[PDB]
Design an enzyme around this catalytic site. Structure first.
Site, PDB file in Angstrom:
ATOM      1  N   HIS F   5      -1.173  30.965 -12.164  1.00  0.00           N
ATOM      2  CA  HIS F   5      -0.470  29.821 -11.587  1.00  0.00           C
ATOM      3  C   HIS F   5      -0.320  29.926 -10.058  1.00  0.00           C
ATOM      4  O   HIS F   5      -0.189  28.903  -9.430  1.00  0.00           O
ATOM      5  CB  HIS F   5       0.907  29.762 -12.249  1.00  0.00           C
ATOM      6  N   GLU F  77       3.684  36.894 -12.464  1.00  0.00           N
ATOM      7  CA  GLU F  77       2.421  36.908 -11.748  1.00  0.00           C
ATOM      8  C   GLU F  77       2.498  37.747 -10.465  1.00  0.00           C
ATOM      9  O   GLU F  77       1.567  38.533 -10.153  1.00  0.00           O
ATOM     10  CB  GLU F  77       1.818  35.517 -11.633  1.00  0.00           C
ATOM     11  N   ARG F 165      28.823  18.443 -15.492  1.00  0.00           N
ATOM     12  CA  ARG F 165      28.918  17.292 -14.617  1.00  0.00           C
ATOM     13  C   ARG F 165      28.983  16.075 -15.505  1.00  0.00           C
ATOM     14  O   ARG F 165      28.278  16.092 -16.524  1.00  0.00           O
ATOM     15  CB  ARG F 165      27.671  17.211 -13.748  1.00  0.00           C
ATOM     16  N   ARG F 220      34.073  23.554  -6.510  1.00  0.00           N
ATOM     17  CA  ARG F 220      34.307  22.352  -7.360  1.00  0.00           C
ATOM     18  C   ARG F 220      35.798  22.283  -7.737  1.00  0.00           C
ATOM     19  O   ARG F 220      36.279  21.241  -8.164  1.00  0.00           O
ATOM     20  CB  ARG F 220      33.386  22.483  -8.582  1.00  0.00           C
TER      21      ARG F 220
END
Ligand SMILES: [K+]
Ligand SMILES: [K+]
Ligand SMILES: [K+]
EC number: 2.4.2.3
Lengths: 250, 250, 250, 250, 250, 250
Positions: F5, F77, F165, F220
């Site tokens: 990839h 990889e 959320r 938050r």
């Protein structure tokens, strides 16, 4: 009718508080037949119900059908109809070497290999029989001189892969269940059948008593094709024991 | 020594094949002292062992420690020294309204809220007691005119969150266990304690016999502080019952 | 007989390779009677079998009983007699507001709230219907101008707690399932019933084709009591649709 | 007493905020002995507690007993008694080829093979040590020239099957745990022990610091019967390190 | 921008209700290119978005990136931006003997070997495609004469161990996944890929339609190094089919 | 190319054995540009790779994409190209009240709320960081006088429901995750993000070293909208810290 499936009214029960629950509708009459006043009450789906009389007391006999789903229905409806005690009777295959064809197995608790017991209690909860019921079944087995083993039963929602049968269409068992039998046999499990895990879980977690006896018709560790006579005999002995137990529990 | 943890040799047991297994190493001496010719064998870790004699047979008393881990050791190491029968004795809090202080509970099977039972059988396998031992316990209780409940116990790896105690450091219960007590209560669970799930699953899956009795010292549904003497009267009563059950299992 | 439970021989099926599989053994005769040359084959347990002929081909109608256990038997034993295609027909309660009494639901796949599907595939494996059978069902419905919803069904091992019915003996739902219906409703689940999760998972994982149609007799979001005739009109309509689908799959 | 099990009052602690927690009560005194003002405080069940003085600061030493259940109790009670930091010290068997007898293992996190960590946090949560504690333990190991490996420990609720011992009464390991060791060894796991998963989970999820050091007494991949001297030595080195770390953490 | 990740505004979509969602940003343009009015809209992270026109109707094309996490983001943001239908197109490896390089696979449902589908619906729920979408994809495949298989796909969150590749850094597969391929191949699973379980679960459980087509580039049961030309061809055929399906769905 | 990839050859890395792994391919250039002799290597998919030089040693910067799937590819990889050390850099939202905008969090281990970590180790295995890398990160932070929290991170396969959320399309959170944030908050979890559970579990179980640092851009619990410059000041600060940690790990 007073319930959704079984096709019974309260009145029909005449005050009955105890039910015997084979799986085969065909066996209902055979068990009814041992007591007094046998009367067919209804036949709908897998639910064949008779009433009968045991020492001047109403007793039901009601098939569950195969599997925890049809069983959970028949217990629920019968409970709404005043049954507090529920004795299962079957015929069954042993999975231990020292059990023989025609011995009797009383179940203390079941390996929960079903789906319906989960709808009553999470898997940690024991699929355990009521002590009263298990005792009546042990003593009843003695009063006719049965050879009895008292132990754990594996309760499967399938007949074929979950009992590790390989002579099937596919011949395969999914990975979860492949080699599970050796484990239950290493753990002293007596036999497989398909409705006790539902039965005992729903009853233990809702204040109902339940118990299970079975008679051995095959031993899969030394497997012989069962002889018609012997199966018939084994069936009536189990039938008798479960009636005797009923009598003690009334 | 013959074993990793217990500090015992095969000779120490003088042929004993039955162990009474309380949790607390203090209780060991008390229980041996009710039988004939008690002699302290060993003491290491939470494991305190005495040997005594009942109706002329050697009998062991061995403490397990709190929890499945140390239980599983005790049982394994006794088993290698020849113990085939394990009878747990405790005192306990009831979570049902109808059980009172001074009653006795005999356990059919346990809700497996512990980690060690899994190292013997997967969760679907019932934490079920031996029928003979259950029978002896209940008979022994009736023999001293105990009020005795027979049913299901929740066996927890913790004292605090797993039994939803909230007067703790954090005052918090994890999600999985918050609200769980109400579930067990709906389901007819009698009590909590912390070694039965291990004891009974390891026993039942290994060919060893086990049972459990306990006397009730608090009810959490109507909770009173126990005075010592009630504790002691209640401990003596469960202790006498366990020794009478041992009698009948010898 | 050629099979353990169904009481059928290979010859009885006269080459049939498609089975219509209602749950109720009563419905069997009704469905066979819509086709040519119906003949009752057998009746044992919850399994009632008829043979008929559709566009000159033999076709079976066989009842499964309620629940995955008895389904898994039926399917396995038909499969050994040569059935490659299984079409379930039912009547059902909708849990969505937009589905009305008299509509028809065709099931793409099912929420696997059962135990027997696991004995074929682990839970991650989709309880998905065959594309050809799904396609035939929906086409047959459109062909009689049905109003037809196509989507997901929740397949439950119980009638009562697993579909959150609370007008029961206990009036209680276990934790795991209390609030679950609202979840399935948020998620666009159309209906509940009690055999599809088994049927479709065992089929899809074994190279057999299966689908399912049902006609709606109640909506639990706006629930009316059905009168019989509506039931019957609704049963005839799903029955005609299943036979028209069978036509196109022969 | 101010707590249910340990038999301590707040006052007894004299303001102590850090506790060292071996499993063996027998080891408590040995660790107490390295600091100043050693005093036995209590001996009840598996909980042997001493207090001592480290640079003019109170430090506790308290055995947990074997297993997450007895450990969770001792942390909970000690926390209610003002202990914020908890250092475990053990002796242990390596499961990796390159570890040698007498090396030291500091644990970053533990494989949760127990039941009590679940009563604090669901299995996804990491059984991780506090960074402060793990650092003090690494540096303390350097200040006496130990050979140290820093890594993951597998925390089992059993000694025997969950560590894959086969020289047992039964000689079998249940299917879940059979071949699990090879997996943990492929995954660079250092050793097995039986209380860290509880320890680290409860502390991480409740704002307490915790850490673990152990000294290697056997290597199961090249297994030698441990020499009495060497075990004794390894024990005092581990004991010393954990005291040095305490000193940095005060 | 109107969303957190993709870098799009509502307006940019010009009223588009259908999105095609390859995984490779590189493929976005190639698919855009088949319709009218192709315009790059944004390139941020793995999200490459073009808009285009299909029969006078806006259509989006948006890469998801590899894996359910990046996919769940792109569906969520695109849905907040008015996309109701979502067609995946990939290239893929077959795992069944009778599938050939260049055939097409339409997915009815996916084995949930990912983590993100759980954040929408518990594992029991089927990762099923929408019937509309699956039909358009089947018929679209016919309108260009593809050889099509219609079936179940295994959706993995890894490329390497969860697809049972062994030519890796480690060369090992964890125990859960070792031998899982044989199981999915026994169960008629067609291929592996890495975003459908997320895709279909999130869409089915939130009222959005979704479907998946892929073209076969390798067959791992008879594995050949893919030829550059053929891959390119297979890609444009899959691309074309998914556009044709879009056209039917608008 | 040497890998499926990433589009890299072994030669491209010029012996590099340490990779800094941000999520966003945009950040790659920024981070390489802080080191000596940066050169872009490749760009495909979410994988953007640069090579640079730090204290005379080659060093890689490679983007992972969002989520465990694409991470697991990158790491695998790179690993085949010789990377032994992986350091993730991010920006993040805190969920604790005491952490402020501009602080830095270094992660000891992660709550494994993802699917790909399981394809390397079962859930009981800790998603734990490498001790050396953790140590370097915290030292580097202290070296620029960061305010720095060191503890546990929740690693989620979704941005939206898995971090609760609710300003989303559906506005709904599945049952399993509704209320979960409050749990992690009770348990001292610092933050959420979406690649660490994968990264750290795959690393720790394969002999590779990994750690993670992040700078806080929102809280938050007291949530303010960030202005760009604060983001940039905060990104530069975590970036400098990660390069200083790389320094000390070379
Ligand atoms: K203990
Ligand atoms: K049935
Ligand atoms: K990605």
């Amino acid at each position: 009718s007073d319930v959704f499936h079984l096709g019974l009214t309260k009145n029909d029960l005449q005050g009955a508080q105890l039910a015997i629950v084979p799986g085969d509708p065909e066996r209902v009459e055979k068990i009814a037949a041992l007591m007094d006043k046998p009367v067919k009450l209804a036949s709908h789906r897998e639910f064949t119900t008779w009433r009968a009389e045991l020492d001047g007391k109403p007793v039901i006999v009601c098939s569950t059908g195969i599997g925890g789903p049809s069983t959970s229905i028949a217990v629920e409806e019968l409970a709404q109809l005043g049954i507090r005690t529920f004795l299962r009777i079957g015929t069954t295959g042993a999975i231990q070497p020292h059990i023989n064809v025609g011995d009797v197995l009383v179940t203390t608790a079941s390996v929960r290999l079903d789906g319906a017991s989960l709808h009553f209690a999470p898997l940690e909860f024991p699929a355990v029989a009521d002590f009263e019921c298990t005792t009546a079944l042990v003593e009843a087995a003695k009063s006719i001189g049965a050879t009895t083993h008292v132990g754990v039963t594996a309760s499967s929602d399938t007949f074929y892969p979950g009992q590790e049968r390989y002579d099937t269409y596919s011949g395969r068992v999914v990975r979860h269940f492949k080699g599970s039998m050796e484990e239950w046999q290493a753990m002293g499990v007596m036999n497989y059948e398909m409705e006790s895990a539902t039965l005992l879980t729903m009853c233990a977690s809702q204040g109902l008593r339940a118990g299970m006896v079975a008679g051995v018709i095959v031993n899969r560790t030394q497997q012989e094709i069962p002889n018609a006579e012997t199966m018939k005999q084994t069936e009536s002995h189990a039938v008798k024991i479960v009636v005797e137990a009923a009598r003690r529990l009334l």
